[PDB]
Design a protein around this ligand. Structure first.
Ligand SMILES: NC(=O)c1ccc[n+]([C@@H]2O[C@H](COP(=O)([O-])OP(=O)(O)OC[C@H]3O[C@@H](n4cnc5c(N)ncnc54)[C@H](O)[C@@H]3O)[C@@H](O)[C@H]2O)c1
Ligand SMILES: NC(=O)c1ccc[n+]([C@@H]2O[C@H](COP(=O)([O-])OP(=O)(O)OC[C@H]3O[C@@H](n4cnc5c(N)ncnc54)[C@H](O)[C@@H]3O)[C@@H](O)[C@H]2O)c1
Ligand SMILES: [Cl-]
Ligand SMILES: [Cl-]
Ligand SMILES: [Cl-]
Ligand SMILES: [Cl-]
Ligand SMILES: [Zn+2]
Ligand SMILES: [Zn+2]
Lengths: 358, 358
């Protein structure tokens, strides 16, 4: 035998450019072989009533689903959506479009997978469980930072917990990166989601699992984040969309760390959304990432960002302990932070003290 | 109608990591459906007698061709190689491997194309002329900087001139980036080929045709080049391989400029190789790229690089004029430098004066 590095599968086709949403209809047309071939549009319901709605190239035969992301995606939701598509028409759609953030894009990835992989989405939560190629699927981010447009995963809250459908088949066939679509995101959520990128970079770049491929992508996306959140460039939306993209590219040969691991306890037990949750966690992690936290804090001041505080002050001991146990279980993240002796530092007590500061 | 941005097609699968050459045999095995399915290895003849030769996973049925790159690739060469493969076996090979620099990788791309596209390689020099998908093809760079592992082109000297087979079908199906394979490149050629990356970045980043996608890739590869040629990092070979890669990625929404346009006259009339030729040209282009040329010159001093000088001092006027006319004809490059009024600055006299300084 020999050791193997990951053979990394990327999004094969991409359009970058402001206004490029207008090209979606042509990309779709190339998949519509028959007159009646149809497309599923999964669209974040934030876009309902906004200028983008009128531009979505929906045909008479197509299925437009408004996705509500008040809660992040779940296996139940995926399974209901996949049955909806199945009841809508006897034919497979020729493409599934995810038009939204990480949540909606992940919904589109997962639906496109479940349309060709029976048994429900929970069954495929894990690594390389998907047996058949997905329906052709297109990702179109309308808020930048998760890198979900680029990744091989779709993160779903299952019967227990948030875990991804990781597979080469998960990857979008096509992405369209049109930063006009993000120009209206509100300041706080713009900050929360873009900090998903920045924080991920900081974590990855301090990790024990890192090569120069991932390092170069993470460095440059962090650089782009600094330009967006500390400077004032006319191309700020294109820069942030590019950062997001580069972040996603960096995932291959890197890992997250202490912020994601903590954030994961907050999300799973207290229902905090992914972006805000990482920001909340990062602000108590100055001992892990002193430079990144200091810079993050200047970024927050620059943009009048106020994080909620005292979230965990009065919670029952038992609820803390549940977050502690979830966080502690994320071995590969803690190994990324501390190396193979991580179990000696990642204690119930050290974690409890972090959560009590949030 | 609407405007369209390019829908950029990238290498779909990639392995990055030192030692990953050992994985080539497994990647090949996945293409060998029948016992007797064969592979073509196109290998730069520099590797003959070197440690790499013994490691190439050549099977009894396979065809190993030593490619001599004393001259850069030509349509005649491509056509002869494609006929050799055709005479070797009645079946199509299941993959074509290019193991070498830009020259060898481009030979592999072009052979893999010609095996499924009859009529000779000259006929396909241009844009999107290829009618049928290529044979599965794998690029494995053994000297870093051209970005040819990433690009949609294969540059061949045709009946006239160097022009590429540009097509989405040209793109490698798989790249393997193993910087162990570049650790032995000699100082001067290491410099010439890595400067292909750096100079390309400088040109692109000053261009009128540039978006933030290409800008971020070009910036980061230029950053990596600076780390390699001005600093002294233990990971210098991984950094340069990554720079090369990122350079290739930047091509989509950018263009070259005055260095490539000049260099092209030198190559076509005087037979200068691509890397050295760009270095030779760049050293007279301080008025176009003052900062890049100054830095390039410190890089040369750091590595005891001496460029040949007085190349054109005594040439016949007529030979200068041929280089001038070739260089002047590269409109899109000159438009990248000066914008749509470029014809008023790009004169016979201005170009002649540059060439007489080389
Ligand atoms: N697949 C992956 O690799 C990956 C990576 C990181 C995170 N994630 C997942 O991504 C999800 C979070 O994604 P996210 O941070 O983009 O947030 P999101 O998709 O939940 O959206 C956040 C909010 O912004 C709103 N929004 C979206 N586009 C907008 C626009 N143009 N204008 C105004 N508002 C807009 C949404 O309606 C929602 O209120 C989580 O479920 C997380 O698990 C996935
Ligand atoms: N397809 C593209 O997008 C693209 C882009 C830029 C340039 N190009 C083309 O690339 C070609 C030049 O490529 P290049 O600069 O890599 O040089 P190359 O392929 O010609 O090789 C240069 C020299 O280095 C030697 N070499 C290669 N690997 C080595 C190793 N491991 N150790 C020692 N010596 C080694 C070669 O034998 C040769 O002498 C030109 O034909 C140019 O037109 C193509
Ligand atoms: Cl829904
Ligand atoms: Cl929340
Ligand atoms: Cl040859
Ligand atoms: Cl030469
Ligand atoms: Zn995240
Ligand atoms: Zn070049």
């Amino acid at each position: 035998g020999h050791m193997s590095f990951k053979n990394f599968k990327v999004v094969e086709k991409m359009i970058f450019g402001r206004g490029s949403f207008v090209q979606l209809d042509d990309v779709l047309a190339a998949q519509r072989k028959a007159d009646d071939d149809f497309v599923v549009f999964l669209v974040d319901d934030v876009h309902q009533g906004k200028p983008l709605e009128a531009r979505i190239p929906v045909k008479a035969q197509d299925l437009l689903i408004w996705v509500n992301v008040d809660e992040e995606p779940s296996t139940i939701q995926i399974d209901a959506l996949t049955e909806q598509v199945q009841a809508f028409n006897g034919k497979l759609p020729v493409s599934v479009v995810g038009l939204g953030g990480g949540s909606t894009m992940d919904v589109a990835k997962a639906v496109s997978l479940m349309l060709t992989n029976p048994g429900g989405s929970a069954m495929y939560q894990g690594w390389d469980l998907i047996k058949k190629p997905a329906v052709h699927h297109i990702g179109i981010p309308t808020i930048s930072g998760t890198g979900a447009e680029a990744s091989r995963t779709a993160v779903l809250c299952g019967p227990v917990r948030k875990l991804g459908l990781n597979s080469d088949y998960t990857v979008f066939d096509q992405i369209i990166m049109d930063s006009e679509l993000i120009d209206g995101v509100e300041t706080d959520q713009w900050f929360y989601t873009g900090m998903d990128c920045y924080i991920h970079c900081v974590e990855s770049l301090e990790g024990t699992f890192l090569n120069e491929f991932s390092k170069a992508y993470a460095e440059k996306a962090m650089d782009l984040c600094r330009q967006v959140y500390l400077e004032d460039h006319p191309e700020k939306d294109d820069k942030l969309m590019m950062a997001s993209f580069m972040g996603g590219m960096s995932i291959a040969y890197s890992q997250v760390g202490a912020c994601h691991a903590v954030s994961y306890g907050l999300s799973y037990i207290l229902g905090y959304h992914h972006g805000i949750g990482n920001c909340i966690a990062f602000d108590v992690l100055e001992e892990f990432y002193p430079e990144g936290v200091a810079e993050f804090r200047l970024m927050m001041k620059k943009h009048n960002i106020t994080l909620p505080k005292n979230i965990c002050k009065d919670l029952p001991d038992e609820t803390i302990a549940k977050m502690v146990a979830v966080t502690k279980s994320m071995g590969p993240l803690w190994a990324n932070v501390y190396g193979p002796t991580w179990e000696e530092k990642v204690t119930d007590e050290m974690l409890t003290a972090l959560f009590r500061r949030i």
